[PDB]
Structures are given as structure tokens and as C-alpha cells.
Amino acid sequence: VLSEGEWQLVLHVWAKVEADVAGHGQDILIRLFKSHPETLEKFDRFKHLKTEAEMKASEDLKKHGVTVLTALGAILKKKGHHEAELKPLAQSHATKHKIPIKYLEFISEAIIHVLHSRHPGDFGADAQGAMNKALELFRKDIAAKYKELGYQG
Numbered sequence: 839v840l841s842e843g844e845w846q847l848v849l850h851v852w853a854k855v856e857a858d859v860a861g862h863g864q865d866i867l868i869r870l871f872k873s874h875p876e877t878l879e880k881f882d883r884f885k886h887l888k889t890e891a892e893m894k895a896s897e898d899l900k901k902h903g904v905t906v907l908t909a910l911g912a913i914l915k916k917k918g919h920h921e922a923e924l925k926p927l928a929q930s931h932a933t934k935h936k937i938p939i940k941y942l943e944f945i946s947e948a949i950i951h952v953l954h955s956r957h958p959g960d961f962g963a964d965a966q967g968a969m970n971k972a973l974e975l976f977r978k979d980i981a982a983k984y985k986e987l988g989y990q991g
């Protein structure tokens with residue numbers, strides 16, 4: 839369980855993300871695909887992209903990054919009360935996309951890396967610790983929902 843003060847560190851950096859959600863989404867997905875190339879294989883829509891330049895030029899990937907970060911932002915704004923938001927996302931990612939918990943750890947690492955690079959004004963050690971706690975809570979709750987849904991994760 840996060841404290842209110844931890845939630846405020848999360849939401850304070852997220853407000854900066856929201857100045858340019860599309861650019862942040864590009865950076866985060868590219869970082870994920872570069873650090874853990876196996877994750878790109880999960881995306882039938884994107885797995886043909888060969889280089890960072892093609893990723894950056896892909897209008898479809900940009901759109902998808904907006905979708906992902908807007909969904910995550912709506913979860914974070916719930917400050918842990920995210921049961922309704924998690925249901926549909928857990929179901930699609932367990933049953934259709936088949937995204938293991940290890941890959942949600944990889945995107946969490948990519949989010950942290952980009953925030954650390956872009957926002958050292960709002961992403962010092964305490965803020966990063968709060969964000970990590972929020973992402974760990976998200977992954978814990980997704981893992982619980984995956985088990986309910988029948989997916990090992």
C-alpha cells in the first residue's frame with residue numbers, strides 16, 4: 839500500500855509525462871524493444887519494425903504508446919483503487935496477447951528508465967521509489983487477476 843505522499847510523487851512526474859504523452863510513449867516502447875527484443879515478438883502489428891528509426895517513424899506505434907500510457911495514467915490516478923480498470927486489461931493481456939509478468943517487469947523498467955532520463959526534476963530517488971512501488975502494486979494485482987483468469991503469467 840502506497841502512502842498519499844508516495845502517490846503525490848507518482849502523480850507529480852506523471853503530470854510532466856502528460857505534457858507530451860505521445861513522445862513519452864515512443865521513448866518507452868522503443869526502450870522496451872531495444873532492452874528486451876523478445877517483447878517485440880508479442881506485437882503482430884509491430885514485429886516487422888527493424889530499427890529505432892523505423893519505430894520512431896511508425897504512426898501506428900505512436901498511437902499505441904498513447905493508448906498504453908493513457909491506460910496506465912488512469913490506473914495511477916486511482917491511487918490503488920484500480921479494480922475496474924485492471925479487469926479488461928488483465929483479460930486481454932492474459933488471454934489474447936499472452937503477456938507474462940516478466941514482460942510487465944520489462945516495461946516497468948523501461949518506464950522508469952525514460953522518466954529518469956527525461957525528468958530528473960521530478961524523478962529523484964524518492965520519486966523513483968514511489969513509482970516503483972506503484973508499478974509493483976500494478977504487477978501484483980495483475981498477477982492475482984491472471985491467476986483468477988487461468989493464465990500462469
Ligand code: HEM
Binds near residue numbers: 880902941
Ligand atoms: C504498463 C503496462 C501495459 C499497459 C497499461 C498496456 C495497455 C494496453 C492497452 C490499453 C492496449 C489496447 C486494449 C487491449 O488490448 O487491452 C494494449 C494492447 C496490447 N498490448 Fe499492452 N499494455 C501494457 C503492457 C504490455 C506489454 C509489456 C506487452 C508486450 C510485451 C503488451 C502487449 C500488447 C499487445 C500485443 C497489444 C495489442 C496491440 C495491437 O495489435 O493492437 N502490453 N495494451
